[PDB]
PDB file of N, CA, C and O in Angstrom:
ATOM      1  N   UNK A   1     -79.879  95.887  26.206  1.00  0.00           N
ATOM      2  CA  UNK A   1     -81.262  95.612  26.575  1.00  0.00           C
ATOM      3  C   UNK A   1     -81.590  96.211  27.939  1.00  0.00           C
ATOM      4  O   UNK A   1     -80.694  96.554  28.711  1.00  0.00           O
ATOM      5  N   UNK A   2     -82.881  96.333  28.231  1.00  0.00           N
ATOM      6  CA  UNK A   2     -83.328  96.888  29.504  1.00  0.00           C
ATOM      7  C   UNK A   2     -84.548  96.136  30.027  1.00  0.00           C
ATOM      8  O   UNK A   2     -85.473  95.832  29.273  1.00  0.00           O
ATOM      9  N   UNK A   3     -84.543  95.839  31.322  1.00  0.00           N
ATOM     10  CA  UNK A   3     -85.649  95.124  31.948  1.00  0.00           C
ATOM     11  C   UNK A   3     -86.947  95.915  31.824  1.00  0.00           C
ATOM     12  O   UNK A   3     -86.966  97.015  31.271  1.00  0.00           O
ATOM     13  N   UNK A   4     -88.031  95.350  32.345  1.00  0.00           N
ATOM     14  CA  UNK A   4     -89.333  96.004  32.296  1.00  0.00           C
ATOM     15  C   UNK A   4     -89.732  96.315  30.858  1.00  0.00           C
ATOM     16  O   UNK A   4     -89.503  97.420  30.365  1.00  0.00           O
ATOM     17  N   UNK A   5     -90.332  95.336  30.190  1.00  0.00           N
ATOM     18  CA  UNK A   5     -90.765  95.507  28.808  1.00  0.00           C
ATOM     19  C   UNK A   5     -91.667  94.355  28.375  1.00  0.00           C
ATOM     20  O   UNK A   5     -91.596  93.256  28.924  1.00  0.00           O
ATOM     21  N   UNK A   6     -92.516  94.615  27.387  1.00  0.00           N
ATOM     22  CA  UNK A   6     -93.433  93.602  26.878  1.00  0.00           C
ATOM     23  C   UNK A   6     -92.671  92.371  26.398  1.00  0.00           C
ATOM     24  O   UNK A   6     -93.129  91.241  26.565  1.00  0.00           O
ATOM     25  N   UNK A   7     -91.506  92.598  25.802  1.00  0.00           N
ATOM     26  CA  UNK A   7     -90.679  91.506  25.299  1.00  0.00           C
ATOM     27  C   UNK A   7     -89.992  90.771  26.445  1.00  0.00           C
ATOM     28  O   UNK A   7     -89.847  89.550  26.411  1.00  0.00           O
ATOM     29  N   UNK A   8     -89.571  91.522  27.456  1.00  0.00           N
ATOM     30  CA  UNK A   8     -88.901  90.941  28.613  1.00  0.00           C
ATOM     31  C   UNK A   8     -89.793  89.915  29.305  1.00  0.00           C
ATOM     32  O   UNK A   8     -89.321  88.870  29.751  1.00  0.00           O
ATOM     33  N   UNK A   9     -91.083  90.222  29.392  1.00  0.00           N
ATOM     34  CA  UNK A   9     -92.040  89.328  30.034  1.00  0.00           C
ATOM     35  C   UNK A   9     -92.285  88.089  29.179  1.00  0.00           C
ATOM     36  O   UNK A   9     -92.554  87.005  29.698  1.00  0.00           O
ATOM     37  N   UNK A  10     -92.189  88.257  27.864  1.00  0.00           N
ATOM     38  CA  UNK A  10     -92.400  87.153  26.935  1.00  0.00           C
ATOM     39  C   UNK A  10     -91.508  85.966  27.288  1.00  0.00           C
ATOM     40  O   UNK A  10     -91.861  84.815  27.032  1.00  0.00           O
ATOM     41  N   UNK A  11     -90.353  86.256  27.876  1.00  0.00           N
ATOM     42  CA  UNK A  11     -89.412  85.212  28.266  1.00  0.00           C
ATOM     43  C   UNK A  11     -89.907  84.466  29.501  1.00  0.00           C
ATOM     44  O   UNK A  11     -89.655  83.273  29.659  1.00  0.00           O
ATOM     45  N   UNK A  12     -90.611  85.180  30.374  1.00  0.00           N
ATOM     46  CA  UNK A  12     -91.140  84.584  31.596  1.00  0.00           C
ATOM     47  C   UNK A  12     -92.496  83.932  31.341  1.00  0.00           C
ATOM     48  O   UNK A  12     -92.907  83.027  32.067  1.00  0.00           O
ATOM     49  N   UNK A  13     -93.184  84.399  30.305  1.00  0.00           N
ATOM     50  CA  UNK A  13     -94.493  83.861  29.954  1.00  0.00           C
ATOM     51  C   UNK A  13     -94.356  82.622  29.076  1.00  0.00           C
ATOM     52  O   UNK A  13     -94.856  81.549  29.415  1.00  0.00           O
ATOM     53  N   UNK A  14     -93.674  82.776  27.946  1.00  0.00           N
ATOM     54  CA  UNK A  14     -93.470  81.670  27.018  1.00  0.00           C
ATOM     55  C   UNK A  14     -92.799  80.490  27.717  1.00  0.00           C
ATOM     56  O   UNK A  14     -92.959  79.341  27.308  1.00  0.00           O
ATOM     57  N   UNK A  15     -92.047  80.786  28.772  1.00  0.00           N
ATOM     58  CA  UNK A  15     -91.353  79.751  29.529  1.00  0.00           C
ATOM     59  C   UNK A  15     -92.325  78.672  29.993  1.00  0.00           C
ATOM     60  O   UNK A  15     -91.962  77.500  30.097  1.00  0.00           O
ATOM     61  N   UNK A  16     -93.560  79.075  30.274  1.00  0.00           N
ATOM     62  CA  UNK A  16     -94.583  78.142  30.727  1.00  0.00           C
ATOM     63  C   UNK A  16     -95.122  77.311  29.568  1.00  0.00           C
ATOM     64  O   UNK A  16     -95.574  76.180  29.756  1.00  0.00           O
ATOM     65  N   UNK A  17     -95.069  77.877  28.366  1.00  0.00           N
ATOM     66  CA  UNK A  17     -95.551  77.188  27.175  1.00  0.00           C
ATOM     67  C   UNK A  17     -94.472  76.286  26.587  1.00  0.00           C
ATOM     68  O   UNK A  17     -94.761  75.394  25.791  1.00  0.00           O
ATOM     69  N   UNK A  18     -93.226  76.524  26.985  1.00  0.00           N
ATOM     70  CA  UNK A  18     -92.103  75.731  26.497  1.00  0.00           C
ATOM     71  C   UNK A  18     -92.373  74.241  26.673  1.00  0.00           C
ATOM     72  O   UNK A  18     -92.325  73.473  25.711  1.00  0.00           O
ATOM     73  N   UNK A  19     -92.655  73.837  27.906  1.00  0.00           N
ATOM     74  CA  UNK A  19     -92.933  72.438  28.207  1.00  0.00           C
ATOM     75  C   UNK A  19     -94.387  72.094  27.902  1.00  0.00           C
ATOM     76  O   UNK A  19     -94.705  70.956  27.556  1.00  0.00           O
ATOM     77  N   UNK A  20     -95.265  73.082  28.032  1.00  0.00           N
ATOM     78  CA  UNK A  20     -96.685  72.883  27.770  1.00  0.00           C
ATOM     79  C   UNK A  20     -96.909  72.347  26.360  1.00  0.00           C
ATOM     80  O   UNK A  20     -97.917  71.696  26.085  1.00  0.00           O
ATOM     81  N   UNK A  21     -95.961  72.622  25.471  1.00  0.00           N
ATOM     82  CA  UNK A  21     -96.054  72.164  24.089  1.00  0.00           C
ATOM     83  C   UNK A  21     -96.129  70.643  24.023  1.00  0.00           C
ATOM     84  O   UNK A  21     -96.879  70.084  23.223  1.00  0.00           O
ATOM     85  N   UNK A  22     -95.349  69.979  24.869  1.00  0.00           N
ATOM     86  CA  UNK A  22     -95.327  68.522  24.904  1.00  0.00           C
ATOM     87  C   UNK A  22     -96.646  67.970  25.434  1.00  0.00           C
ATOM     88  O   UNK A  22     -97.145  66.953  24.951  1.00  0.00           O
ATOM     89  N   UNK A  23     -97.205  68.647  26.431  1.00  0.00           N
ATOM     90  CA  UNK A  23     -98.468  68.226  27.027  1.00  0.00           C
ATOM     91  C   UNK A  23     -99.531  67.998  25.958  1.00  0.00           C
ATOM     92  O   UNK A  23    -100.161  66.942  25.908  1.00  0.00           O
ATOM     93  N   UNK A  24     -99.725  68.995  25.101  1.00  0.00           N
ATOM     94  CA  UNK A  24    -100.709  68.904  24.030  1.00  0.00           C
ATOM     95  C   UNK A  24    -100.486  67.650  23.191  1.00  0.00           C
ATOM     96  O   UNK A  24    -101.433  67.067  22.663  1.00  0.00           O
ATOM     97  N   UNK A  25     -99.228  67.239  23.074  1.00  0.00           N
ATOM     98  CA  UNK A  25     -98.880  66.052  22.301  1.00  0.00           C
ATOM     99  C   UNK A  25     -99.194  64.781  23.083  1.00  0.00           C
ATOM    100  O   UNK A  25     -99.480  63.735  22.500  1.00  0.00           O
ATOM    101  N   UNK A  26     -99.140  64.879  24.406  1.00  0.00           N
ATOM    102  CA  UNK A  26     -99.419  63.737  25.270  1.00  0.00           C
ATOM    103  C   UNK A  26    -100.909  63.406  25.268  1.00  0.00           C
ATOM    104  O   UNK A  26    -101.297  62.243  25.388  1.00  0.00           O
ATOM    105  N   UNK A  27    -101.738  64.435  25.130  1.00  0.00           N
ATOM    106  CA  UNK A  27    -103.184  64.253  25.113  1.00  0.00           C
ATOM    107  C   UNK A  27    -103.616  63.399  23.925  1.00  0.00           C
ATOM    108  O   UNK A  27    -104.620  62.693  23.989  1.00  0.00           O
ATOM    109  N   UNK A  28    -102.848  63.470  22.842  1.00  0.00           N
ATOM    110  CA  UNK A  28    -103.150  62.700  21.641  1.00  0.00           C
ATOM    111  C   UNK A  28    -102.552  61.299  21.727  1.00  0.00           C
ATOM    112  O   UNK A  28    -103.262  60.303  21.596  1.00  0.00           O
ATOM    113  N   UNK A  29    -101.244  61.232  21.949  1.00  0.00           N
ATOM    114  CA  UNK A  29    -100.551  59.953  22.053  1.00  0.00           C
ATOM    115  C   UNK A  29    -101.232  59.042  23.068  1.00  0.00           C
ATOM    116  O   UNK A  29    -101.426  57.851  22.818  1.00  0.00           O
ATOM    117  N   UNK A  30    -101.598  59.609  24.214  1.00  0.00           N
ATOM    118  CA  UNK A  30    -102.260  58.848  25.266  1.00  0.00           C
ATOM    119  C   UNK A  30    -103.514  58.159  24.740  1.00  0.00           C
ATOM    120  O   UNK A  30    -103.943  57.136  25.271  1.00  0.00           O
ATOM    121  N   UNK A  31    -104.099  58.727  23.689  1.00  0.00           N
ATOM    122  CA  UNK A  31    -105.298  58.155  23.107  1.00  0.00           C
ATOM    123  C   UNK A  31    -104.998  56.978  22.198  1.00  0.00           C
ATOM    124  O   UNK A  31    -105.868  56.150  21.933  1.00  0.00           O
ATOM    125  N   UNK A  32    -103.761  56.907  21.717  1.00  0.00           N
ATOM    126  CA  UNK A  32    -103.346  55.826  20.831  1.00  0.00           C
ATOM    127  C   UNK A  32    -103.003  54.571  21.629  1.00  0.00           C
ATOM    128  O   UNK A  32    -103.494  53.481  21.332  1.00  0.00           O
ATOM    129  N   UNK A  33    -102.160  54.731  22.643  1.00  0.00           N
ATOM    130  CA  UNK A  33    -101.754  53.613  23.485  1.00  0.00           C
ATOM    131  C   UNK A  33    -102.961  52.977  24.165  1.00  0.00           C
ATOM    132  O   UNK A  33    -102.942  51.795  24.511  1.00  0.00           O
ATOM    133  N   UNK A  34    -104.012  53.767  24.353  1.00  0.00           N
ATOM    134  CA  UNK A  34    -105.231  53.281  24.989  1.00  0.00           C
ATOM    135  C   UNK A  34    -105.741  52.021  24.297  1.00  0.00           C
ATOM    136  O   UNK A  34    -105.982  51.000  24.941  1.00  0.00           O
ATOM    137  N   UNK A  35    -105.902  52.098  22.980  1.00  0.00           N
ATOM    138  CA  UNK A  35    -106.380  50.964  22.199  1.00  0.00           C
ATOM    139  C   UNK A  35    -107.726  50.472  22.722  1.00  0.00           C
ATOM    140  O   UNK A  35    -108.311  51.072  23.624  1.00  0.00           O
ATOM    141  N   UNK A  36    -108.213  49.376  22.150  1.00  0.00           N
ATOM    142  CA  UNK A  36    -109.489  48.801  22.559  1.00  0.00           C
ATOM    143  C   UNK A  36    -109.454  48.389  24.027  1.00  0.00           C
ATOM    144  O   UNK A  36    -110.409  47.807  24.541  1.00  0.00           O
TER     145      UNK A  36
END
């Protein structure tokens, strides 16, 4: 493999979405625990 590439950046970019995936799930769950 070689640095400097569209795929190489995907590792540094997707890295931010790795945990961000859970966030989207928190936005929903947080609405359930809310209750009346």
